[PDB]
Design a protein around this ligand. Sequence first.
Ligand SMILES: Nc1ncnc2c1ncn2[C@@H]1O[C@H](COP(=O)(O)O)[C@@H](O)[C@H]1O
Ligand SMILES: Nc1ncnc2c1ncn2[C@@H]1O[C@H](COP(=O)(O)O)[C@@H](O)[C@H]1O
Ligand SMILES: N[C@@H](Cc1ccc(B(O)O)cc1)C(=O)O
Ligand SMILES: N[C@@H](Cc1ccc(B(O)O)cc1)C(=O)O
Ligand SMILES: [Cl-]
Ligand SMILES: [Cl-]
Ligand SMILES: [Cl-]
Ligand SMILES: [Cl-]
Ligand SMILES: [Cl-]
Lengths: 309, 309
Amino acid sequence: MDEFELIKRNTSEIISEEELREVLKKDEKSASIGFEPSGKIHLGHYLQIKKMIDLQNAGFDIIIALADLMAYLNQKGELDEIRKIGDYNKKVFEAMGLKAKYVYGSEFQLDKDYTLNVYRLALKTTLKRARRSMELIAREDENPKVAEVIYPIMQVNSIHYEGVDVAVGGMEQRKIHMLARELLPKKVVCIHNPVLTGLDGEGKMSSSKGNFIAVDDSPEEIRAKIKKAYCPAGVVEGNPIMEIAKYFLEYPLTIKRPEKFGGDLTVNSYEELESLFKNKELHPMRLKNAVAEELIKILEPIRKRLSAH
Amino acid sequence: MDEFELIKRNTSEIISEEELREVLKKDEKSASIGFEPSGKIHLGHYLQIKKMIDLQNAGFDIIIALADLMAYLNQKGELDEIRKIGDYNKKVFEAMGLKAKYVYGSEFQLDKDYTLNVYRLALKTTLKRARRSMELIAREDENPKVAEVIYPIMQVNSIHYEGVDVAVGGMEQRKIHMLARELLPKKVVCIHNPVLTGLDGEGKMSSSKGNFIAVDDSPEEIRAKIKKAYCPAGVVEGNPIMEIAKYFLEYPLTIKRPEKFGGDLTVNSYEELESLFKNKELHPMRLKNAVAEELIKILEPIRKRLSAH
Ligand SMILES: Nc1ncnc2c1ncn2[C@@H]1O[C@H](COP(=O)(O)O)[C@@H](O)[C@H]1O
Ligand SMILES: Nc1ncnc2c1ncn2[C@@H]1O[C@H](COP(=O)(O)O)[C@@H](O)[C@H]1O
Ligand SMILES: N[C@@H](Cc1ccc(B(O)O)cc1)C(=O)O
Ligand SMILES: N[C@@H](Cc1ccc(B(O)O)cc1)C(=O)O
Ligand SMILES: [Cl-]
Ligand SMILES: [Cl-]
Ligand SMILES: [Cl-]
Ligand SMILES: [Cl-]
Ligand SMILES: [Cl-]
């Protein structure tokens, strides 16, 4: 595929595709994404880093924001603790094969002229738009705090200071991204990746016990977690095992089976896996066994690289 | 009078009087008030500086915050312009006989550890309490901005950084002051001065054409403005001419009158002026003439001191 195609693959939306095409013409271009530091880096995070690797392979310089100050404003704990989790996150990302510039928010988000810009932005940003932009991001709170409306302005200002042409994240970031397109002189091209379902089949993959696969999980945890996952016979939509198969597995792959149960299956693609599953030619237990074993192998270089440090 | 009494004179409230008494015991104590820089410094401002002078005479060190960054967050214009008005305000205050430390907000309100505290505060401050605290301060806006809820936290944080035992302002500051008492480790004693009615008799004295007496107004403007002021025969409540007579004039004073209109009046106090006015022994035109002429004299040292620079 060409650069545009490689970038577009497996995305949910690009705001806008015409602007992306303009950016691609440039000799130098850059892209960022932020992570509120997370004690587990799971497949949802990995999907985003895979997109950053695609951008890098399309000649973008990559900035990964370790968003320690933003995590602090979104009630993730004390800054010193969040930074220590930040350090671990950086190492995981590095273990995934990303070559990037890694920046801690607090290295610049407290500088005098950054802060002055936060306040300039605050004069332009309505409380209503700021609250609405956080509906899929703010930590639940019955008595919403001022911090909640500072957060999206800090993300916008950080996009500005990073200098990037493209900003990347999950679909839930789209309202903060629209704010950035309205508030800054240079309109950032925004690339949104799909949100991966959790193992439980109750909403997005998150740190909830048994609800995520961490990229550094042991083989026995990957098996245990996949075995327990929501995965009804025939059902592809909202089936996290099928989503894993779509976004992470390599094809062709073969699934191992005695004759009386149909015999072996050579699976040329995800689309073949889908039609086999939807037609009930392939059952949940065998699908889960395949996916776990294939995932273990896919993730092995990340585990090994981490263990070796 | 004793120190407590001198401080309490002409105040609307002291939160709390018991805490003020504790503060008075200290060998070193300090008090602040802020001003969003204002193109005119009027009698309402002068009433507050008179209270700061009382505190100073009671052995407080006085800090006057020239609140350039706060004015910026409350839509008073560009920072460079606001600072130039700030410089002029400082000179007026000095011309009133106040000896103080004058500090521009922007000298410290953009420092890294100040900013970090703003964000700590923001985590503790509800959007609802922040908006409610600004009901009598925020510039009118149909689409309220994030800046509005940053403002009261910056005032609270500035009280903290100033180190003061006492914070002073008009009654409208009381909700921001209550927030400061809840958010900071040391509870500041808060002294609220009454809000002076404008000349128009429509709400508070402000910069509105003809609505204020500036402390540096010429004699002919003071006369013209007083002559036009709302001042109905008999009516003391909401009568700005009577408020001026109460808070600024020196007693005893004599009012000049031909025999057929009652003859001269020696006025021992404001309370005598009040009973004469309420009983219609003294008419609006004569009251206005007296007040203007007495005000001109009271303000003359401020004008002279300013003109002499
Ligand atoms: N379940 C998920 N699926 C896809 N992306 C995700 C998922 N969870 C987190 N991310 C992305 O990782 C970045 C950091 O999100 P968070 O861990 O929620 O701070 C954001 O762009 C998210 O959209
Ligand atoms: N009409 C007024 N009467 C009494 N104090 C006032 C008046 N106008 C402003 N001030 C005080 O001066 C300080 C600065 O207010 P402002 O000029 O509104 O920023 C505040 O403590 C106000 O309460
Ligand atoms: N709001 C993102 C976090 C984030 C995104 C970008 C940046 B940045 O500096 O470009 C920072 C934080 C999240 O939900 O985790
Ligand atoms: N809110 C006040 C302004 C103000 C008060 C105090 C301070 B301070 O630094 O203590 C600053 C501004 C006003 O309405 O004008
Ligand atoms: Cl709000
Ligand atoms: Cl389905
Ligand atoms: Cl099967
Ligand atoms: Cl009355
Ligand atoms: Cl008379």
